[PDB]
């Protein structure tokens, strides 16, 4: 293990063999789950990028978080999808958490500590556990498949991940930057592999 | 394989109305996002109305708050209701099914022939 604490990856250019990939002791289904990152690229209104992946071994989009040109976020669980839309797009570094739940069904998504309107989705349906969570590239199978037009080009860091359902008091202590412990991809203590060109540099934002 | 079958289409009088129907066969509309295209100058298709997967749809700009459209999976058929079209309206007319809901269209995204449509007074 190590602790990426005030370090980022860095992908210099677009391409379609750049990526990293994150392993989990996970090994019981998911019934929940939470997600937090933050990220940072120019991208913007020019082309959609893939943020975040988790694929299976019978579904390529088990988790997807995408930025859709001209419509906003969009968020697929298990091939369903739904998009949250953004009137105007800024040039600035993000953080993102996003939560969904099994039993009640309901999806939160809070930007930038602003919370956005919750809604349903997928409700009563489990989550796989032998997973495959690349960063860098979408992915249309279990492996590689990538797409270079929908690569990132940018930095990202900060990846927290936990099984159950955050509070809001806890997402905002989240963003203000104060102690935690996750339990499923912890980035004080990440394991992960790398290939192609992947840099490790300090992190831009505060 | 995979076959897309469009009705329910023709010429009305100027505010009248008219809804089509979007049949599919092979694929699925629980897993996918469906939307209807209008033609343009060129090869641009013009964003009308998209559903997806999930429930969340978008409408063009230009026809905020005209026309609805929405899917029934049962039978996996997409249905959108046109009311109150101006002569402008009329032209040809599309409905694709993507894993996605992509904005401008995508080449993989299957396409299904057309349609035309008349406001003719």
């Known amino acids: 293990q190590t602790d990426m604490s005030r370090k980022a990856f860095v992908f210099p250019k677009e391409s379609d063999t750049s990526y990293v990939s994150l392993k989990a002791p996970l090994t019981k289904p998911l019934k929940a789950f939470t997600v937090c990152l933050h990220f940072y690229t120019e991208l913007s209104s020019t082309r959609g990028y893939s943020i975040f992946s988790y694929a299976t071994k019978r579904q390529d989009n088990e988790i997807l978080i995408f930025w859709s040109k001209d419509i906003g976020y969009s968020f697929t669980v298990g091939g369903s999808e739904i998009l949250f839309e953004v009137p105007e797009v800024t040039v600035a570094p993000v953080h993102i958490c996003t939560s969904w739940e099994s039993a009640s069904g309901i999806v939160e998504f809070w930007v930038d500590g602003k919370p956005r309107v919750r809604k349903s989705l997928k409700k009563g349906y489990t989550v796989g556990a032998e997973a495959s969570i690349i960063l860098g590239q979408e992915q249309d199978s279990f492996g590689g498949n990538f797409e270079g037009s929908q690569s990132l080009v940018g930095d990202i860091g900060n990846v927290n991940m936990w099984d159950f359902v955050l509070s809001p008091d806890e997402i905002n202590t989240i963003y203000l930057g104060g102690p935690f412990s996750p339990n499923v991809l912890n980035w004080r203590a990440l394991k992960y592999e790398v290939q192609g060109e992947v840099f490790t540099k300090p992190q831009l934002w505060p | 394989h995979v076959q897309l079958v469009e009705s329910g289409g023709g010429l009305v009088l100027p505010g009248g109305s008219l809804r089509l129907s979007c049949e599919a066969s092979?694929?699925?509309?629980?897993?996918?996002?469906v939307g209807w295209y209008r033609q343009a100058p060129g090869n641009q298709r013009t964003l009308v109305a998209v559903?997806?997967?999930?429930?969340?749809?978008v409408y063009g700009d230009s026809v905020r708050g005209r026309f609805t459209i929405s899917k029934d999976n049962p039978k996996n058929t997409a249905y959108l209701l046109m009311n109150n079209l101006k002569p402008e309206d009329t032209g040809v007319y599309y409905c694709?099914?993507?894993?996605?809901?992509?904005?401008?269209?995508?080449?993989?995204?299957?396409w299904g022939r057309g349609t035309q449509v008349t406001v003719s007074s």
């Open positions: 694709n099914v993507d894993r996605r809901v992509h904005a401008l269209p995508r080449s993989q995204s299957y």
């Open positions: 092979g694929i699925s509309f629980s897993s996918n996002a």
């Open positions: 559903i997806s997967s999930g429930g969340s749809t």
